[PDB]
Write a protein that binds this ligand. Structure first.
Ligand SMILES: [Co+2]
Ligand SMILES: [Co+2]
Ligand SMILES: [Fe+3]
Ligand SMILES: [Fe+3]
Lengths: 292, 292
């Protein structure tokens, strides 16, 4: 019941070891359209294929790629990467903005925004039959602006209609993650269908625990570390493994490796007493629940 | 010495009757990339061809199209319109933003922004040999923000290196047009190489005259009218014809006709005592000077 790029859909129970937040490529759509001389698609493709192959060599079965509007989602690029690797790849829909929406959205309703996400979930992405399996939204240093709130409310409509989960970008040093969770739950989204991202950027463990205690997954998803690993280990030590999702990604708005989790983070956890049942919770059971 | 889409360049003295600010098409790059189902390129092409043909039937020889980053500039679409009509079309470079730049520009210098404009002027647009003949920039209700100022300063660098003129979008109800003119002239741009646009939206004639008196062209370029025609006529009556540029465009950020000037504005002017020497000043001599 999870759509996959270039493949038939799969049951959530079969997702296996999952990297929940990794971008194959990211760019600003208007800059790439206007100044293509700044970009090399062939290098981007080779890098993405190599990274996915490296992840598969460490046992990754599924990658969730939350590149959406604002970060250059390209479903045809994603399909080429799948053809070259055989990875299960989950694409999403959504909008990443920090202040205002593009000019297109002037005088358009929240429902019209939600209809875009629902189109991608139910019909397909960018004129293909590859469907979106989650909604991605953001807020950062400017906080919850008028347009940021519109996108959050549209994500809630899409989740209520289609049941796909919601992944967020937040700024770990303000309350944007807590606000995203509150607005979405007030609109009727199940808290366990939300992943509040980019929380590994803060050592304020009480803030992180507050979000998890309210029922949502917490994205310790900036790996690339000790303070992050310390915070991660402390959160694990304190019993929060069933809310933790771990990734590297580095933010797609930035126009390190996808296996640094295997070379740095997981070893560090293991040598500090984290057993293999916790690793399986974080990388298999938590994504299965999120997508269930 | 003016580059033309799909043609050899022309001397500025041969530009003839010119429409200084008309968009063949406009859209938000990220929305079109992400949701192509919202758009019909074949309808857009038919509309653009018909509009250009209608303009040519009224004697227009050259159209300046200030669609740039933020409004969906597409040099290959423009070339198809030229092939279908034979119009002289001047394309530009630049960036239209009201608050912040796309994520690409985080931690990038003004010089790097200017290098993009200079690339389009000296090398070509979007991988073609069609070159940009002017720079287009904007500011609106948020005023001169940090990123808006960066783009203005980059435009000044591009003009100083290449001598192409600068067209602006401004908000007629604040001082953004006056501020654009001041910042550009402080950076060494000749005032007569600047067109401050969207001033037809205000009846504050003293503000408009202040900009013209400082040496820049004033864009009475929102046609589509009486109050605009009244303001235009009053400005003509007061001796400002040699600073007036007239167009319709309607702003490209809006994702009426290009001949409404011939069906409404020019007739109205003529029947109110405006002779044919003024019409020639506004539509032939002023563009020739601007591009000289
Ligand atoms: Co992010
Ligand atoms: Co405008
Ligand atoms: Fe990300
Ligand atoms: Fe315009």
């Amino acid at each position: 019941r999870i759509p996959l790029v270039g493949k038939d859909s799969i049951e959530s129970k079969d997702i296996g070891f999952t990297l929940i937040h990794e971008h194959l490529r990211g760019f600003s759509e208007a800059v790439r359209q206007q100044w293509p001389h700044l970009y090399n698609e062939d290098e981007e493709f080779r890098n993405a294929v190599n990274e996915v192959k490296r992840a598969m060599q460490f046992g990754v079965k599924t990658i969730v790629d939350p590149t959406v509007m604002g970060c250059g989602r390209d479903i045809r690029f994603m399909e080429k990467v799948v053809k070259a690797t055989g990875i299960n790849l989950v694409a999403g829909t959504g909008i990443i903005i920090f202040i205002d929406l593009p000019f297109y959205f002037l005088n358009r309703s929240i429902d019209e925004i939600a209809d875009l996400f629902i189109h991608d979930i139910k019909e397909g992405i960018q004129g293909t039959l590859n469907k979106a399996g989650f909604v991605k939204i953001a807020a950062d240093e400017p906080g919850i602006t008028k347009d940021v709130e519109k996108v959050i409310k549209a994500a809630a409509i899409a989740n209520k209609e289609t049941k796909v989960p919601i992944i967020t970008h937040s700024n770990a040093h303000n309350n944007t993650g807590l606000e995203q969770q509150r607005i979405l739950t007030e609109e009727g989204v199940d808290p366990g269908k939300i992943l509040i991202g980019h929380l590994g950027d803060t050592d304020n463990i009480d803030y992180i625990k507050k979000i998890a205690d309210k029922g949502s997954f917490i994205g310790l998803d900036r790996y690339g570390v000790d303070k992050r690993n310390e915070t991660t280990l402390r959160l694990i030590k304190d019993g929060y493994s069933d809310k933790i999702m771990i990734s590297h990604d580095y933010c797609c708005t930035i126009d390190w490796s996808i296996t640094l989790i295997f070379e740095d983070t997981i070893p560090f956890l293991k040598r500090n007493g984290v057993n293999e049942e916790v690793i399986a919770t974080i990388f298999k059971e938590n994504p299965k629940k999120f997508f269930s």
